[PDB]
């Protein structure tokens, strides 16, 4: 008897391959037997095996995040699928295309207390934009058309704007092993069963009129740019700002701070200097153009929120609604490059004055220049790491930035610079979970060196993710910023309420992470100065190697030091202004 | 200028305490500040701080599994809550009561791209029997009544049969820090705002007629008994099987293989000998009574499923539907003790024939007796562990058993004995996830020694759960069964196909676990013999102390040796006959 | 002191008006007080009061279908909202924008057995693309920004492609009456709080290459056009068929059969003649281009489904996936006009051969000519009503076509003609529910005459929808095709199993509908010939006026007369073809 799984799943897997899927992250199980095996057999899909399904999730995340096209993510029936939940959520908010396949029992064994079986229908709720429970396998030509169409449709839904996770629950009946000598991947058509052509979203010159006029009329504007992934969008946003002569508050994930592009318009110190009331009044713009999601900067958020008379224009091609201020005045569902090209074409020919832009460049330059006069030697002040690391991230490598303080410190401390490198971070939901695995995935995805900057609780959180270093031979340099607990919470007003603060917020572990390096076969460094940090820090991607570089820092004293440093620089700016 | 959070959340947490909540498992975060601070400040609730929310969830699972009453599980907004999903699923199917509180942002900050904010409504779907999005804090008498009522209700729901997880999403608005010096816990009533009294379920004399008739008139019955947690139900199920003279196929989770109760009726080798067609025909029963969920034994499942003419009577007080054979003939939603007694009170004085019982005892005695003559010295054969460890587990302690082969090996090799101890396992959904933390929770829950028997892939899966040892000073003995990979898959007929087997199923980590022991401050042992295993093995609960005992075994040769051993004790049974 | 509801809900309703809402369909209730009163008081919103929520829902459906922009749909707490489900489902599949607002009890009165309170959270599941449970009313400036933003957002989501229903559940605390003397609609800005600019989707020249290339090369192509709304799209689809010389199988809902456009390419008898295997064999195309949802024609479906080697190109601007054949070869997520212009731009100037097209025009013309010769005098044969009615539908009016046989008969017997009028049908889910109220709403919507052709079970189903005639003074001409039961089931192979058929499928009512006309103050006709019909039939929209025109037909003999009549025409075609 032919087993219907051979050609049904064969066709399913083959069609994903035809769709451009080149990678599959697979977690072991018996029930998922045919999905796994057939991904392995298929010559166009590379299989990455991961034991911990939570890490597996964030690994696929990182992979897909790197290439901006989907990867398969496969597990067996039971709590295995439930473990994907954190990564699916992050993928949903970050708009990362993932195709989740979960094996399931057939109907006669569901909802009746069979071993390892759970309700997998709509498991991920609305975090996935497409869900289906595939038909029990069948061999008819009509059902093979159905299964290939399902695969294409799933891949198509993942890549369709609001890119995100999709979910196919795959019930499978016993005899699970596909017959690999019976052309399981056999096709009827020459190429793709169905090719899916998704498109760009545009808003025309005319409906854009209100916005063009307010931009034509406002000398005082600023562009706020969060996470960016498109080169074209970056070139065009930069061009747009020169045409308007508006400064760009550039979030680190925007990657406008680091590159050979023109940066005269780029402002990198705003998170610090905008905490001052007086500089805010001075730099208050009449109009704001936002690109991408909200920047990391809390002071930019508070600024737009607490001053709603500032007219915000929000550009989001995907047509979502990302504006926690409730104060934005225009929500524009337009490709960033189309939007910028249209505005530029509508402006008059006269080069605008750069006076307004100069105020910003003045405040920014004077801020950074004063910071330079303040010592960065002390490795135990957490801030200094970033003041040093910015200059050392090798050209064309990736920097994966942990949540909690590291993404805030990168924002605070990274100045604009001429060397290309990519900053990545899990900013859809800001989890400290699966960060190691995301960085691992990014590495698989880019095939270039990756540095991961990460706090100790986060590191601990995804210790399991280090398995990929050896098991998959994935090179990674981890900069572990270890202040033994949750350093971010020291910034809360409630940090003085000391009877509970340490138990419930500081939460130290006391862990010696050199044992984690050994566990996962990585090398270990614990530099006591930047000279020896520089000697230790050498990311690479030519061969396997896990390098843990641990920096011990003092969370109990960092807040006052941090604030004195910045306040002192802000104070200097105000003095220069008065000259 | 009062913060409404002070008394609103104060009243919320205080009421949980009034309901009998004594433990809160708490994961750090900003938005959950009042939840965590108030649990900490309240004199009746012990706080257990966990960093890894996935671990935290299984830690709470184990705590509530040990006590059969709800604990609080708390986290802040975002992917934190999503990390509770695996434990919530297991609690759902194991029927473990847990009250999940997830901090959220307020409305003006939801669904709008705010930092760390996710859609938390109905987060766990129907794995939870009760969900609500609680009101934004307000301090009026009416809303304080509402909030106290919600806590009790949440508590009551988790304990209402099918016990299980419940979820309250708690949106909170800045000023987050409650004012501790302003009587946050103040009430209007002397005790509980609302006391919830749930009850036992009963089916009456009449409705049990057809069933009590068939049992009376059937000589050839067996009782299948999986996981049980009731002392009364255990006694009565035994009483019952004496009155009828039916054998009891005791799943390890029934715990009927290890206690002071009478065990003449208890059968423990069935999973092994029922693999033979001939012994099955000899011992084919007319009627089967089931208590608890499905036993671990696949052969018992396949028996009832492939011989549908065997009449099954399934007893389930919770009214669930656990029977993947699709062939049971009576589903009875009645308390196990009430059912047993009603069946017994309707039996005549006609002292029952025990030949049928004796056929079972014969087969069990002969199986065990022959196996005993087989050498157990080789530490590298996985089965031997359980053959030795059975006699070593301290009295009044707990053995937590990992999924995959360990629960199966416990089934195969644990014989009935008089030494009392409890066996636990995550058999709701058989995950290899969070097993270490569940054992950790059981230890906290019982304040008695705990031994965890776990395979290597599962141990790696919840390495992070070991943090509880130093951070919470919970003692634990871990017997790490390391065969470097997924040993269970070797039993599959598809293990023969070699090109992919190892990659996709074997999946070795090659991890050296001594480094893990160092990481979490545990003492390490790697005994080459049962003598040094004995010296190393010393579970205790008086002080902190993590002990990792690694047994290296060979999965490549394990199956063939396992089958020989067993097929030989079966052959020997068929001859003694 | 002040009631929060006054400015909270006031700001909510005012912002909907600022969004473009001009109509609110409202159902009475106590808990929905502020919603209904404030809509009533607002100068830009017309309130339409419907008692039966199910009718209300379909009425809102027709109103929004007519104008292609959203309306408010409002009811109190409880089963009232559950009665919107059928309309919401139809709006979802038909892609009709509706903003559904449901009043609710406050938290302290929910899930605790309070009178009339049900769980309204996610009431409509995923039939709505946006749902929220709004905050309890508050008066703070931040919450008035939140609620105005919510109104904009709800409106924006209903109009955002795949247009459809959205749901806001509105919990309200008692004292419910807003203070109308305290400027409930007061703004913080001049004009819209946020303006939402949706755009259009385009695929660029380059990713259209393969499809353009195959279309330039395929002589034998066909365009299949289902429900259309855009005038630009019609013009461009027609232009494209001439550039390519492809016939357009024009579904009645394309409205390509009844307008001033060039119809030289329009094929109208395909549903009939494509039932024949030999004509199918002769007219088989290599490529198919689909616009709009699937047509009504079952024969076209089965054709495309059973010959998967016919290469289909489906254009769907909204990004959905409408193809029940599982056989399509390309899904293009692109504006139809844009797609059309791109293909035309890539075509050479060379004369396109018209022989292929002439085969189709020949078949169609011969079919229709032979049908001309078959008499239509018999008012008891249902087909005839449509052969007569097509020339009688007043120019610039609407024909709303009931589901079941009417839509099929319209497809069968409406030929192309130069007279303009619009045909509407609820083809989203094909329900026989709410058709009257839909019609009523199309009349409110177009401010022009509406004719409704509907079968008797359907007409019975929404008898309540006729209240809108008296109560709301809406004129409607109802052509009631009464065959006493489910006429359509006679085409089933199972109409022979007489032992259960009449009981389960025929389902006669015996109802004398003149009582219904009387109940609702309508005038009644029962024409015995087409002459009496031509005399009674006079759709208008200047005054109130409900006209019920009943046609009694015989479903027992219909099928054979129908099939004989069409097969006769088909056979004439083949004869003619041989000459
Ligand atoms: C999965 C998850 N759980 C909890 C949180 C709440 N949270 C935000 S920051 C933080 C502490 C992070 O500590 P660490 O990684 O050491 O960085 P640090 O604060 O020391 O810079 C926590 C627990 C979260 N963001 N994600
Ligand atoms: C969370 C989860 N992922 C995957 C599975 C599928 N599964 C069942 S047993 C097993 C292998 C476990 O290996 P180990 O703990 O070493 O036990 P062994 O098979 O060697 O006895 C797997 C992957 C599961 N049950 N749960
Ligand atoms: C709400 C609903 N219920 C049932 C159906 C199934 N259905 C399709 S046609 C039909 C019969 C309708 O009869 P009628 O309106 O008299 O038109 P006729 O069939 O006589 O052409 C039914 C019940 C449906 N489409 N919608
Ligand atoms: Mn830290
Ligand atoms: Mn193992
Ligand atoms: Mn009818
Ligand atoms: Na492969
Ligand atoms: Na406490
Ligand atoms: Na009005």
Numbering used by the authors:
A (entry chain D), C (entry chain A): 2 to 580
B (entry chain C): 2 to 578
What's in the article?
Our interest centers on 2-succinyl-5-enolpyruvyl-6-hydroxy-3-cyclohexadiene-1-carboxylate (SEPHCHC) synthase (EC 2.2.1.9) called MenD, the enzyme that catalyzes the first committed step of the classical menaquinone biosynthetic route. MenD shows the three-domain architecture typical of ThDP-dependent enzymes.21 Sequence and structural analyses place MenD in the pyruvate oxidase class of these enzymes, where domain I contains the cofactor pyrimidine-binding motif, domain III binds the diphosphate, and the central domain has variable, often ill-defined, function.
BsMenD crystallizes in an orthorhombic system, space group P212121, with four polypeptide chains, labeled A to D in the asymmetric unit. The structure was solved by use of single-wavelength anomalous diffraction (SAD) methods and refined to 2.35 Å resolution. Size-exclusion chromatography indicated that BsMenD consists of a mixture of dimer and tetramer in solution, with the dimer being much more abundant. A metal cation, assigned as Mn2+, is bound and helps to position the diphosphate group of ThDP and so tether one part of the cofactor to the protein. The active site is polar, primarily basic due to the presence of four arginine residues (32A, 106A, 409B, and 428B) and a lysine (299B).
